[PDB]
Short mmCIF file of N, CA, C and O (backbone and C1' of nucleotides) and ligand atoms in Angstrom, two decimals:
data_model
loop_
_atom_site.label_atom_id
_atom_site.label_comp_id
_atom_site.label_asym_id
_atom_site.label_seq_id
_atom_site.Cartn_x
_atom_site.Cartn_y
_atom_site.Cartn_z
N UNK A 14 12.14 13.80 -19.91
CA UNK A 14 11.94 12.36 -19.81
C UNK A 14 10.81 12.09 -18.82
O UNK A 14 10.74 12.74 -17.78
N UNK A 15 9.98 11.20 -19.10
CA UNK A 15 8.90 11.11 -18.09
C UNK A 15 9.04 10.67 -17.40
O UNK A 15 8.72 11.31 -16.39
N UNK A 16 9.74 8.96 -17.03
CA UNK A 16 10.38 8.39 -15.65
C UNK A 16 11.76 8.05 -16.18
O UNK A 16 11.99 7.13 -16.96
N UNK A 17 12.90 9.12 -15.53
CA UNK A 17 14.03 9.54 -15.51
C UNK A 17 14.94 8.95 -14.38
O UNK A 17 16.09 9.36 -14.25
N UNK A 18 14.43 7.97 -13.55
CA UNK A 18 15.29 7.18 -12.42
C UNK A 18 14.95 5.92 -12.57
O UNK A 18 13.88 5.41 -12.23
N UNK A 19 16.09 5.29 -13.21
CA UNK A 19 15.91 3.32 -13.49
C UNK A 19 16.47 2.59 -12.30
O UNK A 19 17.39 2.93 -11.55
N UNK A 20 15.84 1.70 -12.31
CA UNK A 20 16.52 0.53 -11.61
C UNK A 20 17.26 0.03 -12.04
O UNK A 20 17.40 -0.35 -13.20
N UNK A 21 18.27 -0.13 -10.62
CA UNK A 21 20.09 -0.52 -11.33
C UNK A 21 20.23 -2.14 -11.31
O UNK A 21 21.34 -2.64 -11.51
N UNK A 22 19.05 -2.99 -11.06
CA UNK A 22 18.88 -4.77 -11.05
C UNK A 22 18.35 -4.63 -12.32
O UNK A 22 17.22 -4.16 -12.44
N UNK A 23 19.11 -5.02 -13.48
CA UNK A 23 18.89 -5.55 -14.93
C UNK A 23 17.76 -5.97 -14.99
O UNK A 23 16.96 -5.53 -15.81
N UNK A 24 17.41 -7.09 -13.96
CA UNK A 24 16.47 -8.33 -13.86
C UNK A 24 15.02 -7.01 -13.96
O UNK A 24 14.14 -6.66 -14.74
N UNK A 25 15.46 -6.73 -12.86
CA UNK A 25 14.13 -5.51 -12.77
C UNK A 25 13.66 -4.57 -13.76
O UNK A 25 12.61 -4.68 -14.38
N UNK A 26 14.59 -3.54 -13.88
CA UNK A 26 14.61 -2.25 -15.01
C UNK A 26 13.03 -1.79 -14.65
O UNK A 26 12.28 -1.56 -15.59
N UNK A 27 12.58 -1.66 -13.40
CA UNK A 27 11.31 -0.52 -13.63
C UNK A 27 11.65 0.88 -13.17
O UNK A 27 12.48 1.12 -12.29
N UNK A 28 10.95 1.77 -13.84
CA UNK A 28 11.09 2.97 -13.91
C UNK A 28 10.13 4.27 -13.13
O UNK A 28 8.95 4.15 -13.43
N UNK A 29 10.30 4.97 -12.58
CA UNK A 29 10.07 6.08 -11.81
C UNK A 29 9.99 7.18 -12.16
O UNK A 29 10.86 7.36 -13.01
N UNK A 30 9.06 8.63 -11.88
CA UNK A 30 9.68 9.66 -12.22
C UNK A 30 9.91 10.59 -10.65
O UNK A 30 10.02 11.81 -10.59
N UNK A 31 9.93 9.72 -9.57
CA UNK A 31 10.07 10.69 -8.74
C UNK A 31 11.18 9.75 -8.14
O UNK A 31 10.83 8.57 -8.13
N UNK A 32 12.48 10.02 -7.62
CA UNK A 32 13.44 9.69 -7.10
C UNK A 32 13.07 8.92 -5.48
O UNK A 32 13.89 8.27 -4.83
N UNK A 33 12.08 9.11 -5.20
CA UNK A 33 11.47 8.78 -3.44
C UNK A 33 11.08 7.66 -3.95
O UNK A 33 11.20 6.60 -3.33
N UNK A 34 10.69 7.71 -4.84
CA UNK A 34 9.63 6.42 -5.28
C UNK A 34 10.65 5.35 -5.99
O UNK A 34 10.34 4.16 -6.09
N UNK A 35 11.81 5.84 -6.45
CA UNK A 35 13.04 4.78 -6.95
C UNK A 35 13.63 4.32 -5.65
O UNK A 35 13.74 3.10 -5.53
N UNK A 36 13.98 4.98 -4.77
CA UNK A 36 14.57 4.63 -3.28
C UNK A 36 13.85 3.46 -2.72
O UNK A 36 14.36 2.37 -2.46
N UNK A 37 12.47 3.83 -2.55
CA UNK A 37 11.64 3.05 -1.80
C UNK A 37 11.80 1.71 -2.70
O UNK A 37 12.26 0.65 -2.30
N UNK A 38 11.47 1.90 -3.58
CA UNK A 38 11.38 0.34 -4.48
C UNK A 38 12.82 -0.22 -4.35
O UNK A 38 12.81 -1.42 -4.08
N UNK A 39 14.32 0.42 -4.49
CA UNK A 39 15.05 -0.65 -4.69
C UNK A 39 15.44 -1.22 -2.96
O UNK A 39 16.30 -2.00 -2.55
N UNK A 40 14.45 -0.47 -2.29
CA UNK A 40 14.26 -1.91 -0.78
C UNK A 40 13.99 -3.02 -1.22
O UNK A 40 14.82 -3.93 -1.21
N UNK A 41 12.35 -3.20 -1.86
CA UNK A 41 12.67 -4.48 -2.14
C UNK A 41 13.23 -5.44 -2.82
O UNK A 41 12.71 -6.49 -3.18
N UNK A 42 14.53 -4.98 -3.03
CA UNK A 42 15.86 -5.70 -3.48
C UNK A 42 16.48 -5.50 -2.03
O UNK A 42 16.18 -6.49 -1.35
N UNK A 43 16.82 -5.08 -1.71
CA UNK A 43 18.01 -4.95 -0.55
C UNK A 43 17.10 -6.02 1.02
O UNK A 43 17.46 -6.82 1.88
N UNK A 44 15.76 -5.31 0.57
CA UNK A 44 15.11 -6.04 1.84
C UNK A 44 15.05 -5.54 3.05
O UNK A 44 14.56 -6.26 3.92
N UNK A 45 15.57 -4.12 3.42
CA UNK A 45 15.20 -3.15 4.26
C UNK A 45 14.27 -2.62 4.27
O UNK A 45 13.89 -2.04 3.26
N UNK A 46 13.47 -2.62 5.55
CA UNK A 46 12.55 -2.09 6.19
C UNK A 46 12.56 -1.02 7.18
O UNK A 46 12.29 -1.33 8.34
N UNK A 47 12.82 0.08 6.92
CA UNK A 47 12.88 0.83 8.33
C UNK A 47 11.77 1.58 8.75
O UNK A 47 11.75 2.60 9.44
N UNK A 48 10.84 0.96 8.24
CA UNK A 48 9.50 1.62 9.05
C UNK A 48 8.50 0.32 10.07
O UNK A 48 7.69 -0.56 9.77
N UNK A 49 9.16 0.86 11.48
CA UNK A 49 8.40 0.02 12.54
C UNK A 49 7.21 -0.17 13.54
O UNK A 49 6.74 0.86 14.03
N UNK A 50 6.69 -1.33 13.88
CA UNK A 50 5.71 -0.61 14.32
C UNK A 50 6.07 -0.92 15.93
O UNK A 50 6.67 -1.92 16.32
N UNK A 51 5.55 0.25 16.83
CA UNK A 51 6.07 0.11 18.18
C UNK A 51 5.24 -0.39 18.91
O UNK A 51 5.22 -0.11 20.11
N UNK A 52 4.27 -1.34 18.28
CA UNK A 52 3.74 -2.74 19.43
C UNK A 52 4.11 -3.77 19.45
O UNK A 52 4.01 -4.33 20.54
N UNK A 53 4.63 -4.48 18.42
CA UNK A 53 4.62 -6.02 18.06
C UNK A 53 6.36 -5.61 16.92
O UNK A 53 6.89 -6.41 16.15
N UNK A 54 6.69 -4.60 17.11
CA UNK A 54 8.31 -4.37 16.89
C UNK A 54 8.69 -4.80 15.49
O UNK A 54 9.81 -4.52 15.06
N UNK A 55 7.70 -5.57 14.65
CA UNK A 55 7.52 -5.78 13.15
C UNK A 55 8.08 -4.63 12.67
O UNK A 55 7.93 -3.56 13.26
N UNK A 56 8.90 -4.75 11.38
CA UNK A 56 9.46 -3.65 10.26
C UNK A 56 8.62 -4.50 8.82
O UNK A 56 8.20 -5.60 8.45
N UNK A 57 8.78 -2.86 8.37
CA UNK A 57 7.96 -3.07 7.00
C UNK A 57 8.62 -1.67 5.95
O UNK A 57 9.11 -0.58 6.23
N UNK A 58 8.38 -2.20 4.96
CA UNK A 58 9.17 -1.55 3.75
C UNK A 58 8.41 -0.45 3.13
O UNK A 58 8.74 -0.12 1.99
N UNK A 59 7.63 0.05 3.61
CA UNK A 59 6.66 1.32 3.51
C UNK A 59 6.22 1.60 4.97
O UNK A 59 6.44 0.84 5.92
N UNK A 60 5.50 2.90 5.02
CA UNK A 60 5.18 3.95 5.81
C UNK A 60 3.54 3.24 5.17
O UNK A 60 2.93 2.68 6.07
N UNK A 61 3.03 3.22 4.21
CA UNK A 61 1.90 2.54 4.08
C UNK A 61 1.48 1.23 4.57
O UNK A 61 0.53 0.85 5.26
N UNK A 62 2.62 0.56 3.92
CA UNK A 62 1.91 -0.95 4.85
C UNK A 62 2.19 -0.70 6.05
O UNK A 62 1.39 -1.34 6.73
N UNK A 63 3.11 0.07 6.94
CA UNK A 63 3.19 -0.04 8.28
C UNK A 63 1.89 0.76 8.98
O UNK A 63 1.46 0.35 10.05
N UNK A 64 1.36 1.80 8.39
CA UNK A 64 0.19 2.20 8.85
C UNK A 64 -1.11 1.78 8.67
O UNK A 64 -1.93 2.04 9.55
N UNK A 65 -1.43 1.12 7.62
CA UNK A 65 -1.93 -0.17 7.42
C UNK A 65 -2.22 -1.53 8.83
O UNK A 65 -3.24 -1.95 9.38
N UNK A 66 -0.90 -1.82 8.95
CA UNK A 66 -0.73 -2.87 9.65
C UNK A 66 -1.26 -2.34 11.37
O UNK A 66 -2.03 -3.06 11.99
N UNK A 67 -0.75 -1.05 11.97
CA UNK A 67 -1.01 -0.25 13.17
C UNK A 67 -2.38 -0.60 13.08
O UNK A 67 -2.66 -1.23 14.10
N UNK A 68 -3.51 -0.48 12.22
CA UNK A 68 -4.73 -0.95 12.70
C UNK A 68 -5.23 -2.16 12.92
O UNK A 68 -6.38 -2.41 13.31
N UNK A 69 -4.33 -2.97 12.66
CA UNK A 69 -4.61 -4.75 12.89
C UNK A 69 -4.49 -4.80 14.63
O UNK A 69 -4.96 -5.76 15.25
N UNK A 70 -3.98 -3.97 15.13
CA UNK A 70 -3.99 -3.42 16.96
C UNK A 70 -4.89 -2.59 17.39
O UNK A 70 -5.64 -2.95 18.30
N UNK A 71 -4.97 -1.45 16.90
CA UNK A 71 -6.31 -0.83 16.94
C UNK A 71 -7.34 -1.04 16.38
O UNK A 71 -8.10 -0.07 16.32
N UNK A 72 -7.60 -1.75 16.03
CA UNK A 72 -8.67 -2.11 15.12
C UNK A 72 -9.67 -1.18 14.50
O UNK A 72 -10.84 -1.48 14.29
N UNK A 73 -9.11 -0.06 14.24
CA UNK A 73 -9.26 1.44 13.41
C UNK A 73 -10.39 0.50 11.66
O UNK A 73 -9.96 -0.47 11.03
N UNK A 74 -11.31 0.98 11.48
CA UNK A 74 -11.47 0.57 10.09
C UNK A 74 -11.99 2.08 9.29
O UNK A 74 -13.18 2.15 8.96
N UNK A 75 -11.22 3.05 9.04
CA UNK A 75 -11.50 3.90 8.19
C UNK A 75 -12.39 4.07 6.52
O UNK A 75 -12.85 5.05 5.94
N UNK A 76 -12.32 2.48 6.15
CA UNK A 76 -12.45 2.62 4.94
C UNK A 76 -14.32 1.72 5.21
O UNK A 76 -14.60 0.57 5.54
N UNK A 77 -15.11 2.81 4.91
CA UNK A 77 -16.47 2.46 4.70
C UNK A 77 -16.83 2.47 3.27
O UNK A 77 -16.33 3.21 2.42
N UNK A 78 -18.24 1.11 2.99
CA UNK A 78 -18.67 0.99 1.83
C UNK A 78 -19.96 1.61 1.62
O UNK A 78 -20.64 1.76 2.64
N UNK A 79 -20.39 1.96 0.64
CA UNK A 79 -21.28 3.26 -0.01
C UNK A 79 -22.76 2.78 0.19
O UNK A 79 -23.79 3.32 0.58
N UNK A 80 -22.31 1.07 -0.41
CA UNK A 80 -23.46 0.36 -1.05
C UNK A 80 -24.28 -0.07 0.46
O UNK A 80 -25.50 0.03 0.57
N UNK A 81 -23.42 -0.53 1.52
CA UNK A 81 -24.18 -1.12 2.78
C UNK A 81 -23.83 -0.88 3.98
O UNK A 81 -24.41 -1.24 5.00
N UNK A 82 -21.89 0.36 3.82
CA UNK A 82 -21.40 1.09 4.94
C UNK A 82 -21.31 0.01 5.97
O UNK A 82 -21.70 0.07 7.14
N UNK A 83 -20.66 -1.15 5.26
CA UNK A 83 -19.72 -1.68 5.99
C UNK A 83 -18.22 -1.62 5.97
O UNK A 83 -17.44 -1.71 5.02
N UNK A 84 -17.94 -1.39 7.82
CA UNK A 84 -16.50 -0.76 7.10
C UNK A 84 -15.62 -1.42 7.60
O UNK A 84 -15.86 -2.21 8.52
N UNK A 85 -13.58 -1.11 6.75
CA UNK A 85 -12.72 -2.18 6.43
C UNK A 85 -11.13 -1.30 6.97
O UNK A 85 -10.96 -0.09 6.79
N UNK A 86 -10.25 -2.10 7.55
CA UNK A 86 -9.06 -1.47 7.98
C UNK A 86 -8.72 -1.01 6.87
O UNK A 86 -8.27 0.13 7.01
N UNK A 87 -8.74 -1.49 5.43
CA UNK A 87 -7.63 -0.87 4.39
C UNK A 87 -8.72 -0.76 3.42
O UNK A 87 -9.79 -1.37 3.51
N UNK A 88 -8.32 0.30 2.18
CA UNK A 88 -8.71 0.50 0.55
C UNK A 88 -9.05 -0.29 0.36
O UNK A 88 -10.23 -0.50 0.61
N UNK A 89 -8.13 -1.40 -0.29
CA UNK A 89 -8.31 -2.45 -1.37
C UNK A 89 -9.09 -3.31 -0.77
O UNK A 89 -10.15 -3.27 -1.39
N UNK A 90 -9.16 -4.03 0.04
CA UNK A 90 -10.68 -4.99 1.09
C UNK A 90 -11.68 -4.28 0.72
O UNK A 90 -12.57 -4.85 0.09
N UNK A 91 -11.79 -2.56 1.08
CA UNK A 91 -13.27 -2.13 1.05
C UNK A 91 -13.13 -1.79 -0.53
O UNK A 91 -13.37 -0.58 -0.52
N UNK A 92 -12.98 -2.00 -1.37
CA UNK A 92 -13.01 -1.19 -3.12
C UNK A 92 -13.30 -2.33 -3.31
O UNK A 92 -14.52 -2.46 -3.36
N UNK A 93 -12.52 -3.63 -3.49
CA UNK A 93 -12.70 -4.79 -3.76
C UNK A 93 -13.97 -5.63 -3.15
O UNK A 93 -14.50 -6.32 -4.02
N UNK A 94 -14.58 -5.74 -1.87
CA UNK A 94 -15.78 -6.07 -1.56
C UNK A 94 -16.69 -5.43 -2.49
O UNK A 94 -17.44 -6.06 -3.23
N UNK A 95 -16.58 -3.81 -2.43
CA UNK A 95 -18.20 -3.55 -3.05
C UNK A 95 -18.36 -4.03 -4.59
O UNK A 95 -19.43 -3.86 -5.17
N UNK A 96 -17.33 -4.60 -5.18
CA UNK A 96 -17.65 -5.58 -6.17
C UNK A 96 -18.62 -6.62 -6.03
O UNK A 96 -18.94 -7.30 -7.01
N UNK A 97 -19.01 -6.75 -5.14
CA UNK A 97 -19.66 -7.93 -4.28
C UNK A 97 -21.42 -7.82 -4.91
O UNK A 97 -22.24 -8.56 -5.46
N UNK A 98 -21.32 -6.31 -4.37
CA UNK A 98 -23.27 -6.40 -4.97
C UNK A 98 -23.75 -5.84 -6.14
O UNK A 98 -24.91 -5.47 -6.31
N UNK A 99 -22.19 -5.77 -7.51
CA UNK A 99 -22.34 -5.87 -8.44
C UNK A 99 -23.11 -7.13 -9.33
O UNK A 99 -23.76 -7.02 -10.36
N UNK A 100 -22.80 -8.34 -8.58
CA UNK A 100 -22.90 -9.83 -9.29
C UNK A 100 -23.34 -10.38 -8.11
O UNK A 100 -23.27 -10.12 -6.90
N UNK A 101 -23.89 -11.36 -8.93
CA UNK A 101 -24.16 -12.96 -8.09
C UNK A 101 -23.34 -13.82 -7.45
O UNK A 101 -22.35 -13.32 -6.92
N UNK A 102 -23.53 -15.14 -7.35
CA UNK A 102 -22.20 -16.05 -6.60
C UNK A 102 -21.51 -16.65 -7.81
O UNK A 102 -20.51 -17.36 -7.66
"O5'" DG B 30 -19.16 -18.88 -4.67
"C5'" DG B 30 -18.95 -17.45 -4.69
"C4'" DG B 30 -19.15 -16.87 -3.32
"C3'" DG B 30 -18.92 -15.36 -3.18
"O3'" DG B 30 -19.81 -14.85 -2.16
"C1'" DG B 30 -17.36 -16.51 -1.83
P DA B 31 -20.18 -13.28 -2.10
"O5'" DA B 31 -19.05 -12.67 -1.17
"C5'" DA B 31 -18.04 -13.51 -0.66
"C4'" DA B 31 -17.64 -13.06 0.72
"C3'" DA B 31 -17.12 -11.62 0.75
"O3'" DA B 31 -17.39 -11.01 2.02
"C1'" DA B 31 -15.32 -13.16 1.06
P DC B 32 -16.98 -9.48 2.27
"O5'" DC B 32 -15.59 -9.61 3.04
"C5'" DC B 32 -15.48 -10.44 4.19
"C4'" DC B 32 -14.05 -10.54 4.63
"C3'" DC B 32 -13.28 -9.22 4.58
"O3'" DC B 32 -12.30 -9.20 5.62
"C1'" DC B 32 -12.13 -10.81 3.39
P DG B 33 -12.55 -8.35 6.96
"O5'" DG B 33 -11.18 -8.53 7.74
"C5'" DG B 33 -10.86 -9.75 8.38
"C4'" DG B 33 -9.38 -9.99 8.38
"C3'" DG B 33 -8.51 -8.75 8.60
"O3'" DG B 33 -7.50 -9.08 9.54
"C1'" DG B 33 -7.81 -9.90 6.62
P DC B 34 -6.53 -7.94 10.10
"O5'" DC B 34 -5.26 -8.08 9.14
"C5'" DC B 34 -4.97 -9.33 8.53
"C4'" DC B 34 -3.67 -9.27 7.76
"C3'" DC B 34 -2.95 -7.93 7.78
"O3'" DC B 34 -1.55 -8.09 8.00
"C1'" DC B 34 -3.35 -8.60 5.53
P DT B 35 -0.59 -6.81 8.06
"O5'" DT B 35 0.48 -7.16 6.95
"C5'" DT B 35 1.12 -8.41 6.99
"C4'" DT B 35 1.83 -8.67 5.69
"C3'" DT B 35 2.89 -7.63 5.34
"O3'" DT B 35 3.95 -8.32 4.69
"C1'" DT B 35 1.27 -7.69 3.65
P DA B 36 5.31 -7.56 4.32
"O5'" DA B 36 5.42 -7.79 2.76
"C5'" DA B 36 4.30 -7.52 1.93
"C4'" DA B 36 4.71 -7.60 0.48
"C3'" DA B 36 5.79 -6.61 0.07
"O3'" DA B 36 6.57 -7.17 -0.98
"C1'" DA B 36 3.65 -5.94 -0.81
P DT B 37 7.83 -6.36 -1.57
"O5'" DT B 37 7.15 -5.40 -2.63
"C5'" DT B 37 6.36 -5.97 -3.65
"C4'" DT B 37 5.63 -4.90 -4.41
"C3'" DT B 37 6.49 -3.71 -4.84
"O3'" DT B 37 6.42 -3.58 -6.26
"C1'" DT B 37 4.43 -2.98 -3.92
P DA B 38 7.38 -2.57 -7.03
"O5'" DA B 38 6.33 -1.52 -7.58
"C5'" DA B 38 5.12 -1.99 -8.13
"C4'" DA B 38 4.21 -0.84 -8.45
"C3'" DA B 38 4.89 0.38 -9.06
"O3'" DA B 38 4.07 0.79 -10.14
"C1'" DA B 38 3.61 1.04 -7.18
P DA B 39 4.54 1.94 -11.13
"O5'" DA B 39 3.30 2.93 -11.05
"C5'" DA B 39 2.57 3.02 -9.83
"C4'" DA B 39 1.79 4.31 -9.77
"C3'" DA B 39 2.51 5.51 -10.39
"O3'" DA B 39 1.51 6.37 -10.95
"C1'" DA B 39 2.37 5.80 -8.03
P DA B 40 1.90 7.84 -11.49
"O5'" DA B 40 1.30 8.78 -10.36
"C5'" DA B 40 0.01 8.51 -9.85
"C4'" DA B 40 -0.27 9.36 -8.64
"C3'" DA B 40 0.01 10.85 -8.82
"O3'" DA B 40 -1.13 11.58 -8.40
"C1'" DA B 40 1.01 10.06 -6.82
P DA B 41 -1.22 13.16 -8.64
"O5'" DA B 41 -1.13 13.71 -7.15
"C5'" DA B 41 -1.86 13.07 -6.12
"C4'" DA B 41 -1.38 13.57 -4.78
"C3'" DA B 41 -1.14 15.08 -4.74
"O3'" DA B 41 -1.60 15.57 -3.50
"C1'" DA B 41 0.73 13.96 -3.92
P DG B 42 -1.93 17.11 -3.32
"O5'" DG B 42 -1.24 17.44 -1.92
"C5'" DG B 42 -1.44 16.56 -0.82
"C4'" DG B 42 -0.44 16.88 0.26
"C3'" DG B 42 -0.19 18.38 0.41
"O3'" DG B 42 -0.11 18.66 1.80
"C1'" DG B 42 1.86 17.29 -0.01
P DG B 43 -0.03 20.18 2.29
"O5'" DG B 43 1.50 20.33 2.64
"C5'" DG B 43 2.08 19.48 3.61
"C4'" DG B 43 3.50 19.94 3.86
"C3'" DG B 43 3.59 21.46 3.74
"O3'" DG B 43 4.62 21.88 4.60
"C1'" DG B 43 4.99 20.50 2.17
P DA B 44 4.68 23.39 5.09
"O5'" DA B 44 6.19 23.46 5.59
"C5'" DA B 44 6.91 22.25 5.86
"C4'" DA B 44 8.32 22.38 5.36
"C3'" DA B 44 8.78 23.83 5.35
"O3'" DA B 44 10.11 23.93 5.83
"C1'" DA B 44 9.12 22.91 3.22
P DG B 45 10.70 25.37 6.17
"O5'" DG B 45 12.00 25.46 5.26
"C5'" DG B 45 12.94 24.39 5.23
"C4'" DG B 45 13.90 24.59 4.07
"C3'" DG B 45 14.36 26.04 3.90
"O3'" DG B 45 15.75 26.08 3.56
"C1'" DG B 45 13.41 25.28 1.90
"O5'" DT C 24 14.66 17.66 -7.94
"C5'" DT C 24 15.80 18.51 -7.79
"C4'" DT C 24 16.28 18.55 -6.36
"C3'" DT C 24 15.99 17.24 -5.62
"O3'" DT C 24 17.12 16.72 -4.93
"C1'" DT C 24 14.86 19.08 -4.52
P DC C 25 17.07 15.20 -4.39
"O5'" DC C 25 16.73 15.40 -2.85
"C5'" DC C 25 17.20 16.53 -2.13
"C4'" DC C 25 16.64 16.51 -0.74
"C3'" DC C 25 16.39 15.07 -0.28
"O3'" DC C 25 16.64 14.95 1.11
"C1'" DC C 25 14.32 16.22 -0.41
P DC C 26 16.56 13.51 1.80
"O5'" DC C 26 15.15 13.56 2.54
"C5'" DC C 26 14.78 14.71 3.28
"C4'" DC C 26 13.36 14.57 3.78
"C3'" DC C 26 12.93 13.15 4.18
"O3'" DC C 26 12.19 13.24 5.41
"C1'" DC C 26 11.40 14.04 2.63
P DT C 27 11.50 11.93 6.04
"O5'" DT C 27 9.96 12.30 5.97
"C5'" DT C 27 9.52 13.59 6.35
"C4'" DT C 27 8.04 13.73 6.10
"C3'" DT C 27 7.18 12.61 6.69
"O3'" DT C 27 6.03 13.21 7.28
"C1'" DT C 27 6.80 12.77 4.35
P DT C 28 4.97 12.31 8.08
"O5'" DT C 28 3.86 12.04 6.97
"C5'" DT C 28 3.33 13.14 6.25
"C4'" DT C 28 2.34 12.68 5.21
"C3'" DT C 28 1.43 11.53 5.65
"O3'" DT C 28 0.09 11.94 5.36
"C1'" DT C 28 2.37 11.07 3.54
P DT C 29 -1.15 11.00 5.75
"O5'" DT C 29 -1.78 10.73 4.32
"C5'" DT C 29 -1.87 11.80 3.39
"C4'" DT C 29 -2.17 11.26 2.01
"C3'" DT C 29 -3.31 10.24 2.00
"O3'" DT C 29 -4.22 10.60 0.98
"C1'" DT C 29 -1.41 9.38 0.88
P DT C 30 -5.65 9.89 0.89
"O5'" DT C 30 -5.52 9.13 -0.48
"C5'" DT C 30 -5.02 9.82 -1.60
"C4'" DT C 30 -4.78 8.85 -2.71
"C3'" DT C 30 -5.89 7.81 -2.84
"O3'" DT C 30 -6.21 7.73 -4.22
"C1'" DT C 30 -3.81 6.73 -2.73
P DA C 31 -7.22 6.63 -4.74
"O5'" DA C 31 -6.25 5.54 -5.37
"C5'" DA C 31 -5.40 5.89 -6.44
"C4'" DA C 31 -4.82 4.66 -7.08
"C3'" DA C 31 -5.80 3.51 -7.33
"O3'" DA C 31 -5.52 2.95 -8.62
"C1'" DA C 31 -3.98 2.74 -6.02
P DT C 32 -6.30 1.63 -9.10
"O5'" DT C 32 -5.26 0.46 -8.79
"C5'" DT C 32 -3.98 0.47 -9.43
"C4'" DT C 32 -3.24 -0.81 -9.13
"C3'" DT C 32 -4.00 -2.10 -9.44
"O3'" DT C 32 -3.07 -2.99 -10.07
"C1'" DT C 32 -3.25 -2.13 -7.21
P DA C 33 -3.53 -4.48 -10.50
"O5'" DA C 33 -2.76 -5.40 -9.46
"C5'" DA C 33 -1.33 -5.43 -9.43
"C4'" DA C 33 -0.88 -6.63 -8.63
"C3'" DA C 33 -1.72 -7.87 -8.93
"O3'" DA C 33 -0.87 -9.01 -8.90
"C1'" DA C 33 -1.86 -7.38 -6.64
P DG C 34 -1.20 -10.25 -9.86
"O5'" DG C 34 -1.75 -11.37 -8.87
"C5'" DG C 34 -2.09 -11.03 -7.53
"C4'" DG C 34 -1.11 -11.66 -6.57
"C3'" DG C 34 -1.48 -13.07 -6.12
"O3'" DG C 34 -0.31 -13.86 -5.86
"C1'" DG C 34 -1.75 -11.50 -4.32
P DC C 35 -0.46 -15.43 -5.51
"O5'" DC C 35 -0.40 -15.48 -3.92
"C5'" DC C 35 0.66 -14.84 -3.23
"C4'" DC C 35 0.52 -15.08 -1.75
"C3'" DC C 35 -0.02 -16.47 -1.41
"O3'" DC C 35 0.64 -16.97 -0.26
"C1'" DC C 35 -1.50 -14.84 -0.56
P DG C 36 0.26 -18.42 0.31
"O5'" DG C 36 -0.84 -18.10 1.42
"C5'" DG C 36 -0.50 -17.32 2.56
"C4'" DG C 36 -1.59 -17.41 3.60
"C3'" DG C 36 -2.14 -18.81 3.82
"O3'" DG C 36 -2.37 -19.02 5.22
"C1'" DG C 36 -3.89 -17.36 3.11
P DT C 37 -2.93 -20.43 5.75
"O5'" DT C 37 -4.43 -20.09 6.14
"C5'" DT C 37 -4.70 -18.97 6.96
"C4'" DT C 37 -6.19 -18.72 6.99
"C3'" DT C 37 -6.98 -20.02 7.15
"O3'" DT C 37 -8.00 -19.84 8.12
"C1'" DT C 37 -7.78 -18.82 5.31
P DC C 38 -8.44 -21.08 9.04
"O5'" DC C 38 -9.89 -20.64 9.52
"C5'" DC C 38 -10.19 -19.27 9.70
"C4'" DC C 38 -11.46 -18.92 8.97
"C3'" DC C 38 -12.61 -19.92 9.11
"O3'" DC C 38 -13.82 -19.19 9.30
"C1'" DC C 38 -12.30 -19.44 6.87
P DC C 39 -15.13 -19.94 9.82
"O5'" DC C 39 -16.30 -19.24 9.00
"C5'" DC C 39 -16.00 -18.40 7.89
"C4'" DC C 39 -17.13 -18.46 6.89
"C3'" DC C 39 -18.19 -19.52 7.19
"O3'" DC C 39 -19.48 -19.03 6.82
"C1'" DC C 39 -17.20 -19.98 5.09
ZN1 LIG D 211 14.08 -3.19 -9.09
ZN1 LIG D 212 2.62 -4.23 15.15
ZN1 LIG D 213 -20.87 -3.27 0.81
#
DNA sequence: GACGCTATAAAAGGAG
DNA sequence: TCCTTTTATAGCGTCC
């Protein structure tokens, strides 16, 4: 079976094939967060957004653009900008 | 128009 | 496999 772990909220029914990845998702049903961050004591429902978020304090921006190497705390800001000097306004 | 940021999904790494 | 860690995608909010 290719994704072999369902979600047990009817409403929901999305599907998984790795069991970590069914866990993590039915948080956001339950609404537990146990990944914190130890400045500002915020919880968050991934290990991603919480490492993510750790650079909104450090102001870390790992993610540089190709086109003008300006660079962005997260992926999706810097992937999504360099759309930018594809087009016009 | 752009982008800072959180959510969420999906995949991958590593150890036993 | 279980658990940790990384990579991909979707909006919301706000300032310009
Ligand atoms: Zn669900
Ligand atoms: Zn914090
Ligand atoms: Zn750029």
């Amino acid at each position: 079976m290719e994704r072999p772990y369902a979600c047990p909220v009817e409403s929901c029914d999305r599907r998984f094939s790795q069991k970590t990845n069914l866990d993590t998702h039915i948080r956001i049903h339950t609404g537990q967060k146990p990944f914190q961050c130890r400045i500002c004591m915020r919880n968050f429902s991934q290990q991603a957004s919480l490492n993510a978020h750790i650079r909104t304090h450090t102001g870390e921006k790992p993610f540089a653009c190709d086109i003008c190497g300006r660079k962005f705390a997260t992926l999706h800001t810097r992937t999504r900008h360099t759309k930018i000097h594809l087009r016009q306004k």
